[PDB]
Amino acid sequence: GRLIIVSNRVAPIPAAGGLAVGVYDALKETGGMWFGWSGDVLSSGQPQIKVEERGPVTFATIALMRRDYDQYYRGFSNATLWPAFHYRADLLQYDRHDFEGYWRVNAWLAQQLVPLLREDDVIWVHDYHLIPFAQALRAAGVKNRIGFFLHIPFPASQVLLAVPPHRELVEALCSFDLLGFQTAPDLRAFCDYIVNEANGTADPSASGPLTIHAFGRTLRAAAYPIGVYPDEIAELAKAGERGKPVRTMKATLHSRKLIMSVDRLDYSKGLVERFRAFERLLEHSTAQRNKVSFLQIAPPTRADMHAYQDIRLQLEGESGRINGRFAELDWTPILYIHKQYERSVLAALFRTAHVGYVTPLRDGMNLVAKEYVSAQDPENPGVLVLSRFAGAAQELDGALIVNPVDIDGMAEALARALDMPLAERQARHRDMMVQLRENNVSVWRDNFMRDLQG
Ligand SMILES: O=c1ccn([C@@H]2O[C@H](COP(=O)(O)OP(=O)(O)O)[C@@H](O)[C@H]2O)c(=O)[nH]1
Numbered sequence: 001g002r003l004i005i006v007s008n009r010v011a012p013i014p015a016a017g018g019l020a021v022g023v024y025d026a027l028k029e030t031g032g033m034w035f036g037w038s039g040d041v042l043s044s045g046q047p048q049i050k051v052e053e054r055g056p057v058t059f060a061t062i063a064l065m066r067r068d069y070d071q072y073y074r075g076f077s078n079a080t081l082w083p084a085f086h087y088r089a090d091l092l093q094y095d096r097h098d099f100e101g102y103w104r105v106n107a108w109l110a111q112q113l114v115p116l117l118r119e120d121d122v123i124w125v126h127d128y129h130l131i132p133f134a135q136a137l138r139a140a141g142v143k144n145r146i147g148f149f150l151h152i153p154f155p156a157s158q159v160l161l162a163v164p165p166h167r168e169l170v171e172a173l174c175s176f177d178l179l180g181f182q183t184a185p186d187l188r189a190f191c192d193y194i195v196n197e198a199n200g201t202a203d204p205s206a207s208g209p210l211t212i213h214a215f216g217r218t219l220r221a222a223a224y225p226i227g228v229y230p231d232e233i234a235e236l237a238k239a240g241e242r243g244k245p246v247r248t249m250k251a252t253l254h255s256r257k258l259i260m261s262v263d264r265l266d267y268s269k270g271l272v273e274r275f276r277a278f279e280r281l282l283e284h285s286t287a288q289r290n291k292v293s294f295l296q297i298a299p300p301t302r303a304d305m306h307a308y309q310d311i312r313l314q315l316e317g318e319s320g321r322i323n324g325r326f327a328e329l330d331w332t333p334i335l336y337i338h339k340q341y342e343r344s345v346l347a348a349l350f351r352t353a354h355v356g357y358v359t360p361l362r363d364g365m366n367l368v369a370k371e372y373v374s375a376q377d378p379e380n381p382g383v384l385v386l387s388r389f390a391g392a393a394q395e396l397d398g399a400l401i402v403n404p405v406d407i408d409g410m411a412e413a414l415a416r417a418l419d420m421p422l423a424e425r426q427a428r429h430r431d432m433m434v435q436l437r438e439n440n441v442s443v444w445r446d447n448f449m450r451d452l453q454g
């Protein structure tokens with residue numbers, strides 16, 4: 001059967017975002033179709049699907065009308081769902097008219113997909129934009145198997161209650177044949193809502209996935225943590241070891257140690273707290289001054305949204321304060337760059353960084369954490385400092401796990417990472433590489449597809 005991937009964001013045919021990276025890694029091996037938004041917005045006219053073969057993948061993409069982009073994507077998806085599911089009800093905005101457009105765009109996108117389907121296609125929908133998609137497909141006569149994978153956290157039921165149409169969203173989720181979440185706590189939160197807010201049931205099974213009964217429907221649900229190709233990232237990082245970015249980075253640092261971060265400039269990424277803990281490191285450790293620099297690559301994301309403009313402004317003021325307090329004529333403590341980089345360049349740079357600094361307030365998985373570890377030279381690997389609220393913390397035992405709210409704790413982790421002896425750095429890296437290898441992105445895809453077809 002042909003695998004049909006459905007997502008809002010489709011890989012570029014460099015972009016920051018782990019969905020596009022991970023889905024493309026999975027899809028290029030099996031081949032199939034990738035259907036979704038082209039990334040373009042129309043002021044007038046009519047969107048038209050564009051079908052194009054790129055090796056084993058068929059891309060089927062379509063623009064959004066401005067009104068659809070505003071209501072479905074900027075509106076309900078990123079002004080309601082994204083903040084709510086990342087435990088930011090304070091940033092949640094809700095507009096009934098945007099929620100209706102969100103529902104309408106899902107139905108319109110499903111209508112665009114129907115003519116391309118075949119009887120034995122297997123449909124795999126990805127992420128929070130497309131929660132109503134199975135319901136729309138079924139209403140359009142579609143009988144294929146349909147699975148869903150949520151890339152972002154599934155919030156605690158009490159937090160989900162802040163989304164006014166929470167019940168309609170969860171009922172729509174129950175039209176899927178199979179629901180996949182990143183981690184066990186995500187699945188637990190879903191089941192907690194089903195049992196305690198939807199009057200349904202969630203039962204274990206010998207097969208693996210739970211059986212869900214709710215809203216008159218029966219379906220399955222399980223956790224499938226998205227992974228990477230760790231040995232592929234290692235070879236990529238090694239192949240850049242004599243490239244210009246690594247060579248100029250080395251020259252600029254001239255023997256100073258490097259703390260490195262790579263994050264869309266999203267309020268979910270805890271970047272203000274991250275900067276404050278680097279500042280706290282410098283306040284308390286005079287020996288670290290002029291001996292380390294912090295590279296934060298923070299590409300623009302969703303920049304036409306006030307909330308993203310706000311977090312950008314806050315972070316830029318942080319960099320100015322901290323640099324102003326601690327800089328010397330030959331030392332800039334924080335190297336803040338508000339631009340996207342090629343993933344191949346980031347891998348090469350990860351391999352030169354003594355510390356990978358990944359401290360999101362909430363994160364469904366965080367591929368950057370897995371990429372940082374994968375890039376390391378096993379003869380001399382750096383240390384991952386990792387938020388306990390990143391989904392990757394459930395499996396990456398060799399990281400230094402921190403609570404991003406605890407500024408002192410994060411600064412102490414930075415000091416511990418910078419001074420960690422080789423033997424322990426290697427032991428942690430070795431353990432994590434085993435985990436990443438056994439639970440790579442091919443295994444993830446095979447596991448979900450096995451459950452969806454069974
Ligand atoms: O300039 C950049 C920044 C990030 N990324 C990639 O974007 C992904 C980010 O995924 P992650 O899970 O860390 O976070 P997200 O953006 O999905 O919240 C990773 O594969 C990064 O290598 C990239 O290609 N270029």
Ligand SMILES: O=P(O)(O)OC[C@H]1O[C@H](O)[C@H](O)[C@@H](O)[C@@H]1O
Nearest residue numbers: 009016017018019020127151152
């Ligand atoms: O697609 P954007 O809005 O640019 O955000 C980039 C990506 O961020 C996260 O990874 C989301 O889980 C993806 O669904 C999204 O594609």
